[PDB]
């Protein structure tokens, strides 16, 4: 099944956001990235995908399908805006085993704060 975000200059959270930040999924489904602003792109956070995940990034002002294979947490950013917290969290399957380590982990603040907020609405 595929899920659909989209890559904003504004949205709900402010600035540079995607649309959902939270994406809750199952093996073999597919996330389909949408360049409705342009400036964006979609790539994986090193050391936040689960082992045996390939990383990945995509082309600037691309819609990018990403299929989502490995059960855990998927960090991503959109390689500019990382800075100004332009992420979202993809979770397949339940209990995703490297959530608490990807909140640990060293990120920007604003990132931090996005990604504390979909958690706890996730819950
Ligand atoms: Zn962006």
Redesign the pocket.
């Known amino acids: 099944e595929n899920i659909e975000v989209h890559?904003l200059?504004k949205g709900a959270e402010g600035a540079?956001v995607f649309e959902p930040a939270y994406i809750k999924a199952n093996p073999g489904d597919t996330v389909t990235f949408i360049p409705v602003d342009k400036?964006?792109?979609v790539e994986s956070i090193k050391d936040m995908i689960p082992e045996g995940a390939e990383k990945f990034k995509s082309k600037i002002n691309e819609n990018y399908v990403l299929t989502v294979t490995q059960p855990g947490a998927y960090l991503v950013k959109?390689?500019?805006?990382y800075a100004?917290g332009?992420i979202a969290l993809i979770a397949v399957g339940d209990s995703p085993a490297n959530l608490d380590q990807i909140v640990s982990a060293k990120k920007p603040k604003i990132v931090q704060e996005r990604l504390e907020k979909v958690i706890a609405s996730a819950k």
Do not use: Q, Y
């Open positions: 890559m200059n540079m400036g964006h792109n959109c390689t500019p805006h100004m332009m």
